[PDB]
Design a protein around this ligand. Sequence first.
Ligand code: HEM
Length: 395
Amino acid sequence: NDLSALTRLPFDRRIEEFFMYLGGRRGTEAVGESREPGVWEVFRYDEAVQVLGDHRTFSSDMNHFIPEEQRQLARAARGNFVGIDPPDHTQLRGLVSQAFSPRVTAALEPRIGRLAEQLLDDIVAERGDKASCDLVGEFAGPLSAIVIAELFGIPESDHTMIAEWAKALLGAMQNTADLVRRAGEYLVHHITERRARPQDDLTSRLATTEVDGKRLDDEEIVGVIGMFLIAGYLPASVLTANTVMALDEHPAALAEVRSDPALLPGAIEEVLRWRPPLVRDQRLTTRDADLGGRTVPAGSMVCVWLASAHRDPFRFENPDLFDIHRNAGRHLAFGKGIHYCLGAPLARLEARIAVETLLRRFERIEIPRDESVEFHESIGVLGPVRLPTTLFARR
Ligand code: HEM
């Protein structure tokens, strides 16, 4: 398979041979073993769905088997429920979900609008009507970090800082430990501040919501805020750029969307299917598991290829065709079951406004096929971290 080699190929051929790899295996088998010793891969839709649905058999807690005595440092941090299983997940997500109601996401739409325009005006001032820039570095990445910052009611002054903090951490080392620890210190101050004097933001809501007599404490809230930033930053920025790139690579689709921007959310859903930011989702078998005509032994790492599931012709017609008019609703880009992305509404809103603004303001968006386009190094990500473009402002 040589998956590590693919992460080093030019992005265009990385995409190619990545989907060729998945295609070949998916063609023959729903499930299979990998070169890695005790790891299985999932290639087909139904089995991907089955895996995500059956959280009992396929755990999200990678330290499931670690003895309860040696579990203290293997335990997930207070507030982080992405790496835990019911019933611990249900209670924590229950609280966060109640607080993070759809109207919290909806209310951000005007700000996201204004922020996207401001980032574009900063790029335009430096290089004029024909302005070259890094779309991820100067637009999508700041927009994703600051949007999440806005959600939690982080002061306007600290936004450029938060954007830089996110770029540093996300793109072990003593610094990595520091960034995490200092973020901790910062967020505690933010929380106690918003607990004392509340404002219309998610931090204050997290601090004041009850669910059947239960609340979140300051240290859990820190984990939640931190979890949102870590889970949400890269993928959202990648969705915004993958949309720009996918439309660029399809002039007809692009023309349709430019002429009727109502088509854009549908286009984004297609992007999520056809070039998902997060390309795999991992689980750990708690027991011997019958899947795809095969038995997966207890203790096995399972790697669910979401990207392959989306190309499964059993589930999607003409799977390898990018079609902004397709019903992409069944895609798994935001996961499925109990761990389904809490940021999915916000990401769709973030992405829609960011590309809506770029198309309205720039009549030409030129993107190279060089190695100047730098895709994120992880096999589990598919999209750029450095995307140089040339923006020609509409006359
Ligand atoms: C387009 C961008 C995004 C993608 C592709 C994405 C994808 C995902 C996926 C696949 C999961 C499921 C992980 C699993 O099953 O174990 C997930 C969980 C999550 N995402 Fe996102 N996400 C995105 C943006 C965001 C944003 C903007 C936020 C909020 C700041 C966010 C917060 C979360 C949280 C909190 C979870 C965990 C929910 C849980 O564990 O129950 N995500 N995301």
